[model samples]
Target: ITGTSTVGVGRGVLGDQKNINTTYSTYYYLQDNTRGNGIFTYDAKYRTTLPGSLWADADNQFFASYDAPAVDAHYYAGVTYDYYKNVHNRLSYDGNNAAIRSSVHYSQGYNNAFWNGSQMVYGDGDGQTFIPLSGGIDVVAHELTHAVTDYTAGLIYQNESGAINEAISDIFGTLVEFYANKNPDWEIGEDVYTPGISGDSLRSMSDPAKYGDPDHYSKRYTGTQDNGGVHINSGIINKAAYLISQGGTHYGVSVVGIGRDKLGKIFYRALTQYLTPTSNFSQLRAAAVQSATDLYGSTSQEVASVKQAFDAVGVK
Candidate 1:
């Protein structure tokens, strides 16, 4: 929708007040023209239909309970875009400044959010398992990172490749969380997961096994469920990423912490340059090592830490 770009005040699902970019046509619409081509958010109206309707409000102030999800979806999308452009030097998910779109309040009691090939979709949780998923900045970035992967590596969403894809989303998700600098941690979906239970997340990058996810290759799930345990096996890669960023010893193997920026650099290079659709864990190890070599030289500590991180996770 073409109109004057305007800023609107709103409160997110977590009751945090923030300003969102909106469009002023007949009414204020959640269409941010400031970033990339634009960032558009829609209201799903608790239905399964896609990009439902462009969210419209008479006033630019969004404070109703129903507007909470859309507020975070729109605001966080902008934050994720800034993270990519400022930190990684990527224009957008497609590296061409593609317009970002999102739809909130998806099916009733919906428990997940995802990037459906073209745009982002968020579910307002049943208030038990989750609130509104868009309330979590990491969750938003995770879904958007899937779009980045779709445009870059195109990793298949099955088996090891799928696990890599999931881990990549988690990796960038945590990085973006840190970039935002708001209660950052190595946890995923902690902000919006389980209002009843505290100190728990959907997954953990620092200690995946805390949530029954495998942190080592020896414990990798080989079952047919979960698309060949894509989410389960991602713990291995996530643990490796954690070690690369914040070094630790596992099963007698130790890694030297190279910090988050280098971890992101190595993985970003690997994802954009060396990974493929069918890449497996071993292949991912090679790609990360090669990426580190490309960025910091074969003999540099970055390359050494990459090797040790993969070895610590038993990737080789």
Candidate 2:
């Protein structure tokens, strides 16, 4: 659809008021033209069909309960885009300003959100398990980071490589949460997961084992479920990332904190330059070490901390 770019006022799933970019022809559509090529959001209408319809509003004011998910999806996609452009200097998920797109209310009681290789899709979870997933900035960023990984590392979504892929999304998701300055924490999907539960998240970067995920390589799940435990085993890498950013002792190993900015820089370098589709846990360690060395010198504490973080997670 073609129209003059415009702005609209909306209330999100969390009931927060914000402005969203829209396109106006005969009606306002949720097609933001301000960032990169554009950020387009759609309505799934509780169906399985993808990218159903461009969300349109008669008055350019989205305050209805049904509009909440679209509001958050569209708004958060823009925030994630800004994070990449401003923090990583990447134009978009593809480094070419690819138009970001998302669909909300994907199905009735769907409990998860995902990147379908082309666009982001959010599920309106059963009220017990979740609300609209787009309400969570980390959830939106996590899925978008999958797009970034698909374009860059192309890491196969299975076994060790898959675990690394999942962890990368979690790492950047948390970083983006911090970037947005919205009650930042080293947790995944806390805001949208389990609306009934308090102070809980889908996963914890600081303490993966708290959620029964392995924080050490020796404890990694070897089962074939979940694409060789992609989500289950990501804890090992997530813990290492947490240690790299905020130094802590794990099992007898201690890492010196390098802070989030340096942690992001090293990981970004590794993801873009060194990692491969089949890279495993050991390879990831080497990549992170090399990445830190390249950015902060071989003798820098950053490199040492990278080594220590992996060691703390028993990656070596």
Candidate 3:
């Protein structure tokens, strides 16, 4: 508990590890290790030998000598590390020396990624649309954030709680991408697509309503795909956050632009230290608004806007 650590939950094996550097950090692969010189071992099959192997694809996928997972995971870890440092002024994952690890080439034609109890895992893609699931930095950050969720709140994996879990990951994932240079203007697997099609990415933060999907949550809706399809349904929160940050309106809330640092601080505190597994929409709305007010002031427009956004999304 003194220092943050890495967990390797792969092949039915769970191992804990310390950092290679004397000064530990959460999400970076820049240590002086023998495995590819602290850069993780890679193979032509796109498999990654990070702290520990999480899951792998079918051992096919790659054309030549390429480690897609290594590239993407390292990039994601670095981005997340830098984002926390630059924006939040936090040291690493746990504010201590806790290095992060990820694995790719997981499961044959698997379509998603996850953080079990320790390391993150990814699928190699179906060869049609996604050969390298690790190509997106946002996705990697999203997975690592699952660990963050477990560490904080431990939100129940049902209904609103589940949706919040998914939304939180995707929100931070987008933030990570923003921290990096890539613009997610398109889709998640845009680069993997063979080309010549409408080819769209998942959820649009700019405007989820543009997708023509039910932009707001309803009692009839039941999140059930992946732990209630939290990842997918999270478009609601994604759009709300986007509007709140950029200044706009949806559902019912009047939007306001209070800048990124203030917005991020409210969210970070709510996620890391103030929420619980059973927290619902009302709870989040009150807690987050209170957090913003405590940090800013009761009259701060940022507090009002974020609170309204949560309710506007369908939380009574």
How many backbone clashes does every candidate have? 0, 0, 8
In candidate 3, clashing pairs total 8
Q: Which lDDT values do the candidates have, in the order given? A: 0.95, 0.94, 0.59
Error in Å for residue 125 of model 2: 0.6
**lDDT-sorted candidate list, best first:** 1, 2, 3
Model 1: lDDT of residue 247: 95
Q: What lDDT tens digits, residue by residue, belong to model 1 across residues 117-216?
A: 8999999999999999999999999999999999999999999999999999999999999999858999999999999999999999999999999999
Q: Residues 182-219, candidate 3, lDDT per residue (tens digit)?
A: 65542243444433445566556666655543446662
Output the lDDT of residue 274, model 1.
93
Worst 10 residues of 2 by lDDT: 188-197
Point out where model 2 deviates above 4 Å. Answer: none
RMSD of each: 0.8, 0.9, 8.4
